[PDB]
Write a protein that binds this ligand. Structure first.
Ligand code: HEM
Length: 137
């Protein structure tokens, strides 16, 4: 289920984080505009860029904490407010997060592993609802 999936992802988090983030950026190429330095680079090149690996892992470090603190795939209001108020998320709208979790769920469905893809789909929707409620446009 959802909780075990958190453990599975945390057991190889840098690799899962990079693979899911790349699935997101490759499914939605315009999303690279939010990072600038990722433009014009293949996956293997991005994986050799220090900030890509370090920032992407930290993204998923926090994502797993928010998932772990959720109840029935519904994140805490305080976690949603943190994601809205982060200076690094100044530009973002809920659409950016919706697309990320579409790609994450698609990644899990295509995976050979028994991820609870439906729970991650609910989590993505519930997180988008919470971000909107906490003031993200
Ligand atoms: C649950 C989902 C997300 C979580 C937990 C999360 C978390 C984080 C964290 C921890 C950082 C700091 C990284 C660092 O400074 O090393 C960060 C930075 C950033 N995030 Fe998010 N993020 C999420 C979703 C998104 C999405 C969907 C986008 C855009 C499509 C986004 C755009 C950015 C940008 C532009 C930065 C700063 C620039 C950069 O790190 O290169 N984030 N995020």
């Amino acid at each position: 289920g959802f909780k075990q999936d958190i453990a599975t992802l945390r057991g190889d988090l840098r690799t899962y984080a990079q693979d899911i983030w790349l699935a997101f950026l490759n499914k939605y190429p315009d999303e690279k505009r939010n990072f600038k330095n990722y433009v014009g680079k293949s996956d293997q090149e991005l994986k050799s860029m220090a900030k890509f690996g370090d920032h992407t892992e930290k993204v998923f470090n926090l994502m797993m904490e928010v998932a772990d603190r959720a109840t029935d795939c519904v994140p805490l209001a305080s976690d949603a407010s943190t994601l809205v108020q982060m200076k690094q998320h100044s530009g973002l709208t809920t659409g950016n997060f919706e697309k990320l979790f579409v790609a994450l769920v698609e990644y899990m469905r295509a995976s050979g592993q028994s991820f609870d893809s439906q729970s991650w789909d609910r989590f993505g929707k519930n997180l988008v609802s919470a971000l909107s409620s906490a003031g993200m446009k």
